[PDB]
Design a protein around this ligand. Structure first.
Ligand SMILES: *[C@@H]1O[C@H](CO)[C@@H](O[C@@H]2O[C@H](CO)[C@@H](O[C@@H]3O[C@H](CO)[C@@H](O)[C@H](O)[C@@H]3O)[C@H](O)[C@H]2NC(C)=O)[C@H](O)[C@H]1NC(C)=O
Ligand SMILES: *[C@@H]1O[C@H](CO)[C@@H](O)[C@H](O)[C@H]1NC(C)=O
Ligand SMILES: *[C@@H]1O[C@H](CO)[C@@H](O)[C@H](O)[C@H]1NC(C)=O
Ligand SMILES: CC(=O)OCC[N+](C)(C)C
Ligand SMILES: CC(=O)OCC[N+](C)(C)C
Lengths: 218, 218, 326, 230, 165
């Protein structure tokens, strides 16, 4: 048994998307396909369901009209269409295999990530940050490499060939005004800091950008 | 619909300590068939939920015996005898009885340990920012626990709250500690007019707020 | 849908060949169909019937191996019924014929003609076959790894509406005409309740009579059914309004006191708007004067709703049946 | 829960020739196949699980049972049985607001009873004739019919009270002090009291108003016996 | 005509299904609280008692795989072995008659017939308390009469057209 979903989708506000869930290894036409929306903040919300064999569909009151289910039997796939995309509709959507009053939602899709925004594929605007001139030096000092003005996600910020895997705190990205921004910090001894050579290996696979600019000691 | 509620929202518990999650229902979810269809789903971060318990007590094949569900009517509890690292995640209820089928609020299980003091560091903007025509002031609050943390910004003595950016990281694994990267952004005319930029931290481990200030005039 | 059809199958058998010269010029013979291989064509969408032909007449056999088999059969196929425009509805009932065990690579169906043969049709007198054309399709089933062909016949039949028109629609229209007459009936006759109750009961009876005809499907609602339901709602409203009006009409100073605002409104403003002028009459007796005033208020209230209902009924009927016609 | 009911129909497959020691039945898939299903239009399919059952006490019994969980689509009956039933039931209370002078109370209440009884018989003809449980709609109609019969009796009594004159009945002092002073105050009626025959008419009207309240709280509370269904 | 299980010692077991329409005399004295006694008389048609004799496998009729109808409940079902002679033929013919004693569950018919009948009967004497000025005594009594007649006709379509009870 295995449910496969489509890849991440990025669409402008007011558009409509069509997410596909394909199931194999079982009787596809006789199992309901629960669709679940999980906002990045928190909370799993059930959108609705469809029984591909027949055409029956149920929609939760919140998502009624927003979502439309169509099931194709020839190819073992079920499709959900979201109408009039907006900001709050950006989330990860799951498809699951359910049979009411019997076998539960045992198998899930890998999860399709949908983001709604009018921004374009802006490359990174990394601004490496170094300790301020007015800062004491202790036996244990923390570095920093800030990445901002970038879109879409994700960006695999790290150190030289994983120079220091431990002590790394890659904070989650956030939308400052319209482009995602994040920050990272690692803890390194101050004694070795003048000697050791470490660079924040910033990367942006969506823009195919791999820039590794270190922080020169102040 | 049947409103499902879970308490507590967070249930800190140390390793090897029994934990209990509560699940209440708006109305009785017992069904005429002689069974009540309640299910428990655990979602590790960045993964699709995995079924754990269905029909209150029955265990989905392949789950550790430590899990154990129970309840009746409108009061259900999921008990974990000896938790571990792999038990971290979010637990959701699910009522499979009354159409439409709705999810629970969600319970974020965390692990409790010795209280850890915060680590506060402050950095100013960068030269490239200065050229870009703005300001990006940020201080890191790293390795603090528990979640009883707060942050505020005191510019030139005055408190600045407009345009304040807040960002934090969930519980770690190597040290099981939190982090915060709240920031704020100013303009050049704003950047060069105030004398001192400060951001403070309030934590349980230290009732007296921590102070980390740097002077623009230097 | 029950039908009485002749299934005209024809194929080539390579073993049943002969040269008529040797057999006294016997070009063709009729042999029992149970002695020869026959295609196992079955009716897929069967319901309360037989899947395959059961009569097994004798099959014509020619000297070049050809075989012609034309057995009769009564097929009770399933077909989804649409009663939106009953009794003026047009149905589209289909029959799906195909080989049940020989896939395309072994047996293939060739459309003999492209239209059901109606030369020997027996005109039912209740339905008119607008069109009946067989379409060739080939699709794969999850049963098996081979493509299975079939031929789908779509019988587009249109109902002749005279019988059901006369027997349901016209009586329903006659009963509906009386929905508003309760408001024009004077309160003194003591028959308003009788009339409105009788209309409501008759409308419910006709709703049930229509219900026992149409299928119990939840996809569509017949237009006549919706119209009857709305007329029933309006008749219930008329009954409630009539009870209130009768209560108003029978008020007297010994029982009720007329608020000044009621007198003002319903004896100066409302009557003027309705073009009904009360004669300027002075009654010496105070109780009779008020008693008559209550009676006039009852007439005014009825006249308000008579206009309100006649406007609603006239708009509703046109706003419900006109678009379907166009 | 008719017409919002859900049926659980089973199909049991066995070999009526060979027992478990001769042939063993196995399930190719845990659910029935809908790969070529045609939607019903009245009944909605929910689940078609398949289970293989053995009898631990016999060891020669084996079968495969498919549970067909179907859910009725309720619009047709919700339009053809419930709405008319509710419309008829709403008329049960009007008889108590109908002036006794009109001479139409009996007609209204009797017609309501007739309609309710006809609908009850129809509902009895639509459902199986089994005596295990009663449709909530049928129970609610039965309770409404009982209420309407009580209303017929009450209307007969009120008509008898209304058509009383001082030349044929004498009003006891307690009747006065109750019905013309106390009860009207509770019901916010405040007899104008600005002749004995009209006192009887008011007394008859007071009884109606009292029962109009009782038949409104109960009827409104009758939603408890109806709202539970949907 | 299913397959018959044959054992090495000459035994033969035959368990074929059957759907029989057996006539039974219905007593509706206490309808809808009546109890019916409908019999099925089984016996060999051509083999007399000297060539085939029937034995009762078990007095009680097996109900292990019974499917509860929901309308009737089997109070008792016992087969009785009877032997009698017919005027056709000079030989004694044995038989086994099974008496099914079935008790009706009265909830359905109770609610659908008895209760409306009680409600209509409650109004029988009201016409004598109605004032004559109302001018609706006739309507009430006529309604009662016609309702009772309609219910009598409705019952008529259920009970058998017998004259014994
Ligand atoms: C539809 O009807 C069928 C038969 O009336 C119901 O099947 C029965 O369901 C119950 C509840 O699960 C079964 O009892 C349980 O069996 C399991 C496994 O043996 C046992 O572990 C439990 O403790 C409990 O005893 C029962 O065996 C089963 N019977 C059959 C013949 O299948 C079914 O539940 C109904 N479904 C719905 C949705 O109404
Ligand atoms: C009748 O139904 C068939 C198949 O459902 C369809 O192809 C055809 O277009 C229909 N005809 C009409 C006139 O709607
Ligand atoms: C049923 O009828 C048979 C014969 O008609 C009789 O022997 C038996 O006693 C009856 N059962 C009861 C309970 O009376
Ligand atoms: C091989 C066989 O018997 O197939 C039957 C099913 N059908 C008609 C879809 C092919
Ligand atoms: C000999 C024979 O066929 O008898 C049949 C009639 N019966 C059942 C009364 C004996």
């Amino acid at each position: 048994v295995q449910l496969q979903q489509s890849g991440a989708e990025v669409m402008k506000p007011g558009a409509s998307v069509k997410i596909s869930c394909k199931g194999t290894g079982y009787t596809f036409s006789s199992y309901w396909i629960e669709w679940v929306k999980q906002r990045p903040g928190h909370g799993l919300e059930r959108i609705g369901e469809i029984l591909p064999g027949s055409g029956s569909t149920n929609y939760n009151e919140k998502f009624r009209g927003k979502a439309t289910f169509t099931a194709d039997k020839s190819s073992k796939t079920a499709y959900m269409q979201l109408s009039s995309l907006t900001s709050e509709d950006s989330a990860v959507y799951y498809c699951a295999r359910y049979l009411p009053y019997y076998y539960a939602m045992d198998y899930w899709g890998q999860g399709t990530s949908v983001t709604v925004s009018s921004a374009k594929t802006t490359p990174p605007s990394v601004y490496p940050l170094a300790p301020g001139s007015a800062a004491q030096t202790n036996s244990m000092v923390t570095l920093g490499c800030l990445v901002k003005g970038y879109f879409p996600e994700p960006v695999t910020v790290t150190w030289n060939s994983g120079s220091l895997s431990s002590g790394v705190h890659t904070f989650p990205a956030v939308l400052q005004s319209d482009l995602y921004t994040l920050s990272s910090s690692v803890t390194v001894p101050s004694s070795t800091w003048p000697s050791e050579t470490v660079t924040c290996n910033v990367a942006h696979p969506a823009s195919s950008t791999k820039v590794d600019k270190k922080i020169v000691p102040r | 619909d049947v409103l499902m509620t879970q308490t507590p929202l967070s249930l800190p518990v140390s390793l090897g300590d029994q934990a209990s999650i509560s699940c209440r229902s708006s109305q009785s979810i017992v069904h005429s068939n002689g069974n009540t269809y309640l299910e428990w789903y655990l979602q590790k971060p960045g993964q699709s939920p995995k079924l754990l318990i269905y029909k209150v007590s029955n265990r989905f094949s392949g789950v550790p015996d430590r899990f154990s569900g129970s309840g009746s009517g409108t009061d259900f509890t999921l008990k974990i005898s000896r938790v571990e690292a792999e038990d971290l995640g979010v637990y959701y209820c699910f009522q499979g009885s009354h159409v439409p089928w709705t999810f629970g609020g969600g319970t974020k299980l965390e692990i409790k340990r010795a209280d850890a003091a915060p680590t506060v560091s402050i950095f100013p903007p960068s030269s490239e920012q200065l050229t870009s025509g703005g300001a990006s002031v940020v201080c890191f609050l790293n390795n603090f626990y528990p979640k009883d943390i707060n942050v505020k910004w005191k510019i030139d003595g005055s408190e600045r709250q407009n345009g304040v950016l807040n960002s934090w990281t969930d519980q770690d694994s190597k040290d099981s500690t939190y982090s915060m990267s709240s920031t704020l952004t100013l303009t050049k005319d704003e950047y060069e007019r105030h004398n001192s930029y400060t951001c403070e931290a309030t934590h349980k481990t230290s009732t007296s707020p921590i102070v980390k200030s740097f002077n623009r005039n230097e | 849908m029950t039908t009485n059809v002749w299934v005209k199958q024809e194929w080539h058998d390579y073993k049943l060949r002969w040269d008529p010269a040797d057999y006294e010029n016997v070009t063709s013979i009729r042999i029992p169909s149970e002695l020869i291989w026959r295609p196992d064509i079955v009716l897929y969408n069967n319901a309360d019937g037989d899947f395959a032909v059961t009569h097994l007449t004798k099959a014509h056999l020619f000297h070049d191996g050809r075989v012609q088999w034309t057995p009769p059969a009564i097929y009770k196929s399933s077909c989804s019924i649409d009663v939106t425009f009953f009794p003026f509805d047009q149905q589209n009932c289909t029959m799906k014929f195909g080989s049940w065990t020989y896939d395309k690579a072994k047996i293939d169906l060739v459309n003999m003609h492209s239209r059901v043969d109606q030369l020997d049709f027996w005109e039912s007198g209740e339905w008119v076959i607008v069109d009946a054309v067989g379409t060739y399709n080939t699709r794969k089933y999850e049963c098996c790894a081979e493509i299975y062909p079939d031929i789908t016949y779509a019988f587009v039949i249109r109902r002749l509406p005279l019988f059901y028109t006369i027997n349901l629609i016209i009586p329903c229209l006659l009963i509906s005409c009386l929905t508003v007459l309760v408001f024009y009936l004077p309160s003194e006759c003591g028959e308003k309740i009788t009339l409105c109750i009788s209309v409501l009961l008759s409308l419910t009876v006709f709703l049930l009579l229509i219900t026992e005809i149409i299928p119990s499907t939840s996809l569509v609602i017949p237009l006549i059914g919706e119209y009857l339901l709305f007329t029933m709602i309006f008749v219930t409203l008329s009954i409630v309004i009539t009870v209130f009006v009768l209560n108003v009409h029978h008020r007297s100073p010994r029982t009720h006191t007329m608020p000044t605002w009621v007198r003002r409104v319903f004896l100066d403003i409302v009557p003027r708007l309705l073009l009904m002028k009360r004669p300027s009459v002075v009654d010496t007796d105070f109780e009779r004067s008020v008693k008559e005033d209550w009676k006039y208020v009852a007439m005014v209230i009825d006249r308000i709703f008579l206009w309100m209902f006649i406007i609603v009924c006239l708009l509703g009927t046109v706003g419900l049946f006109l678009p379907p016609w166009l | 829960h008719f017409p919002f009911d859900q049926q659980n129909c089973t199909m049991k497959f066995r070999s009526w020739t060979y027992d478990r020691t001769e042939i063993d039945l196995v399930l190719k898939s845990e659910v029935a196949s809908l790969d070529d299903f045609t939607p019903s239009g009245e009944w909605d399919i929910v689940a078609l699980p398949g289970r293989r059952n053995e009898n631990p006490d016999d060891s020669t019994y084996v079968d495969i049972t498919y549970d067909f969980i179907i859910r009725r689509k309720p619009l047709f009956y919700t339009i053809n049985l419930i709405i008319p039933c509710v419309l008829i039931t709403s008329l049960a209370i009007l008889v108590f607001y109908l002036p006794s002078d009109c001479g139409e109370k009996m007609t209204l209440c009797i017609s309501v009873l007739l309609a309710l009884t006809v609908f009850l018989l129809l509902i009895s003809k639509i459902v199986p004739p089994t005596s295990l449980d009663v449709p909530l709609v049928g129970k609610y109609l039965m309770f409404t019919m009982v209420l309407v019969t009580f209303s017929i009796v009450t209307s007969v009594c009120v008509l008898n009270v209304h058509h009383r004159s001082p030349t044929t009945h004498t009003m006891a002092p307690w009747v006065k002090v109750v019905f013309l002073e106390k009860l009207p105050a509770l019901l916010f009626m405040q007899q104008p009291r600005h002749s004995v025959s009209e006192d009887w008419k008011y007394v008859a009207m007071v009884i109606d108003r009292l029962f109009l309240w009782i038949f409104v709280f109960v009827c409104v509370f009758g939603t408890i016996g109806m709202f539970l269904q949907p």
